[PDB]
Structures are given as structure tokens and as C-alpha cells.
Amino acid sequence: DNQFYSVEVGDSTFTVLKRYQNLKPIGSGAQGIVCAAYDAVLDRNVAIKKLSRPFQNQTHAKRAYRELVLMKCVNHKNIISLLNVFTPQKTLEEFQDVYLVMELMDANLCQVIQMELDHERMSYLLYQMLCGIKHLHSAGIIHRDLKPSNIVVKSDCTLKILDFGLARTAGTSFMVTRYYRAPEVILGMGYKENVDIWSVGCIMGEMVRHKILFPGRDYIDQWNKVIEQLGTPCPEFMKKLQPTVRNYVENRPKYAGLTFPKLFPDSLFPADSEHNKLKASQARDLLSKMLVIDPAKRISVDDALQHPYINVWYDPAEVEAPPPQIQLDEREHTIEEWKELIYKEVMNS
Numbered sequence: 340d341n342q343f344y345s346v347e348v349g350d351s352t353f354t355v356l357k358r359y360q361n362l363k364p365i366g367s368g369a370q371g372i373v374c375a376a377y378d379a380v381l382d383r384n385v386a387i388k389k390l391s392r393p394f395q396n397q398t399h400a401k402r403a404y405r406e407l408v409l410m411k412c413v414n415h416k417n418i419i420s421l422l423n424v425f426t427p428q429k430t431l432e433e434f435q436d437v438y439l440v441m442e443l444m445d446a447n448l449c450q451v452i453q454m455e456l457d458h459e460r461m462s463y464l465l466y467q468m469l470c471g472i473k474h475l476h477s478a479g480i481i482h483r484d485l486k487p488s489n490i491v492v493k494s495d496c497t498l499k500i501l502d503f504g505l506a507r508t509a510g511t512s513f514m515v516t517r518y519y520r521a522p523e524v525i526l527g528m529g530y531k532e533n534v535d536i537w538s539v540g541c542i543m544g545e546m547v548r549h550k551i552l553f554p555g556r557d558y559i560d561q562w563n564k565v566i567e568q569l570g571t572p573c574p575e576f577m578k579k580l581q582p583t584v585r586n587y588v589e590n591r592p593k594y595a596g597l598t599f600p601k602l603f604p605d606s607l608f609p610a611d612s613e614h615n616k617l618k619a620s621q622a623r624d625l626l627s628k629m630l631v632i633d634p635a636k637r638i639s640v641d642d643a644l645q646h647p648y649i650n651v652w653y654d655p656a657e658v659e660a661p662p663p664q665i666q667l668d669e670r671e672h673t674i675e676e677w678k679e680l681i682y683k684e685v686m687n688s
């Protein structure tokens with residue numbers, strides 16, 4: 340350790356480059372061991388993430404390789420970019436830790452979501468979400484696990500997605516916050532690109548309500564909250580379900596579902612006149628198109644960006660940006676083989 344020094348941050352040992360100073364913890368969990376620091380070389384504040392046990396198992400190593408490769412290849416203003424990556428260990432044998440250095444954002448969507456939002460800020464945040472999600476979809480990355488904790492914002496209202504979710508896999512399956520997962524993911528029906536639109540709808544509804552739309556101890560409790568509010572899905576949808584989950588879903592008491600005016604009343608929106616009246620109905624209309632159980636009837640990312648509530652921000656330069664090309668991302672390896680794949684990524688950057 341010549342260019343490195345150690346410091347205990349939030350009950351975790353950070354062995355970082357001497358260029359990163361005044362390390363401060365930036366408190367949460369689940370994902371991950373993150374702190375804030377000042378980069379002396381760049382004269383800017385950064386966020387340093389220490390990966391939690393990347394070689395504990397193959398799921399950790401596959402997720403670490405995937406995140407490191409995608410953060411490097413993707414270059415979009417609404418997706419967090421990798422400023423730097425390093426390991427304090429000198430050889431492949433000694434190699435055990437990975438530190439991802441990214442731009443420091445001011446707050447997580449989980450805190451911004453709780454703020455009284457104006458239609459200008461709200462539509463801008465959703466526009467950026469839809470921009471980032473569009474950019475990921477263009478490269479074949481279907482997130483499937485978009486949630487407020489996976490999204491960060493800056494003081495100037497600029498938004499960035501942290502994660503890539505299940506990314507390039509072909510089956511909606513994970514394994515602690517499941518309130519944003521689309522019904523087709525929960526019930527295991529298969530998905531299309533608009534699976535991420537449900538998560539955007541959940542997040543938007545929460546911005547309006549200041550309460551989680553579909554809370555619950557588990558998926559069974561969660562599904563009740565979905566049918567109580569949106570109504571029981573069509574027989575056509577319930578036909579597309581597996582006979583065993585279908586049995587439970589069809590045996591539930593039938594709900595007509597509260598209308599979107601009743602789900603999101605004018606009371607939850609800025610009052611009085613004329614611009615605010617216009618904007619309350621536009622926001623509610625977009626929610627009625629995003630918060631749809633049946634994905635065959637749910638709005639796409641492209642059409643959502645074309646919606647009058649969002650289209651006010653539409654910029655072809657941000658929306659129609661070229662997709663990232665490519666490593667690869669669906670082949671299994673031993674933990675030793677992932678370690679070497681991860682080591683070469685950290686070293687060749």
C-alpha cells in the first residue's frame with residue numbers, strides 16, 4: 340500500500356487510493372457498502388462503492404461482472420457512469436475487493452419521492468427515468484427490478500439509474516423490496532419491455548400518494564393490494580397464468596377496482612387553477628396507462644415519452660441516443676472463473 344491508505348467508514352474497511360479523501364458514509368444498505376469522498380485529482384465529489392463479498396457465490400460474481408461491464412459500456416446521462424475502478428490487491432491470488440468510483444448524487448429517489456412535488460419536477464424525473472429505461476431496452480437490458488432505492492438524483496433535479504437489474508437474462512426470477520415488481524414477474528408469466536413501465540407507474544403513484552401503492556409482508560398480501568385498487572384482471576390474463584397460481588388468483592374475491600380519479604384524487608395534486616387543473620388530469624391519465632396489470636394493455640416506454648405529461652421535455656438528442664454495443668451476459672462460470680473475469684475487467688479499464 341503506497342498509493343493506497345485504509346479508513347473505517349460505516350463499520351466497513353475502505354482501502355482506497357490516496358486521491359480519495361474526506362470519506363463520509365452515505366447510509367442505507369441491501370445494495371451496498373457505499374460512501375462519499377472528495378477526489379483530489381479531479382477536484383470533484385465522488386461516490387465509492389465497495390462490493391460486498393463479490394465471490395461469496397456465483398450470483399454475487401455474475402451480478403458484479405454484469406454491473407462492472409455495463410457501467411463501463413453504457414454512456415447515458417440518466418445511467419450512473421463509472422469514473423474509476425480499482426483493487427488494493429496486487430495479484431489475482433491476493434485479489435478479493437472491487438471499488439467502483441462514480442459521480443456523487445445528492446439524494447436517493449426514496450427521499451425525493453417523499454417531497455411535495457410540482458408537476459415540473461415530477462414530469463422531469465419521470466422523463467429521465469423513461470430516457471434511461473429506453474436506453475437500456477435498446478441494448479436488450481430489461482431491468483425487471485426498478486425501485487426508488489436503485490435511483491439517485493442531484494440538486495438540479497437530474498436523475499440517474501444505479502442498477503441494471505436482471506439485465507440480459509431470460510426469466511423474471513430474483514433470489515427485500517418487492518412493492519415495484521410487475522405482476523407478470525410476481526406470478527411468473529414471462530415479460531416484455533413494458534415490464535419496467537409498471538415499476539415507473541408504482542414510483543409515480545407513490546410520488547402522488549406519499550405512500551407505497553402496493554405494500555405487504557409478501558407477494559400474496561401484495562397481490563391483494565393490487566386487485567383491491569385496480570380490480571380483478573380479465574379472464575384472458577388469468578388464462579395466460581399457470582394452472583396452480585391461476586387457481587389461487589381466480590379463487591380471490593372479485594374486485595371492480597377503484598377508478599383512477601378515486602385512486603389519485605385532485606386532493607393529492609397541486610390546486611387552484613388552471614395549469615394545475617390541466618396537469619392533474621394529464622398525470623392521472625398517464626398513471627391509468629402505466630398501472631395496468633395486463634402487460635398487453637400497459638403503455639410502452641416510447642408511447643409514455645410521447646404522452647402530453649412527459650413530451651414537454653422530449654429531446655431527440657436524449658431520447659433517440661445510439662444504443663451501447665455489447666461480455667457476454669448469460670453464460671455460467673465457477674467462482675474462480677468469475678474472479679478472473681472480474682480481475683481482468685478491473686485491470687483492463
Ligand SMILES: *[C@H](CC(=O)Nc1cccc(C(=O)Nc2ccc(Nc3nccc(-c4cccnc4)n3)cc2)c1)CN(C)C
Pocket residue numbers: 365366367370371373386388441442443444445446447449450486487488491501516551
Ligand atoms: C425508502 C428507502 C429510504 O428512504 N432510504 C433512504 C432514506 C434517506 C437517505 C438515503 C440515502 O442516504 N440514500 C442515498 C443514496 C445515494 C446518494 N448519492 C449517491 N451518489 C452516487 C451513487 C450512490 C450509490 C451508489 C450505489 C449504491 N448506493 C448509492 N449514491 C445519497 C443518498 C436513503 C424505501 N422506499 C422504497 C419505501
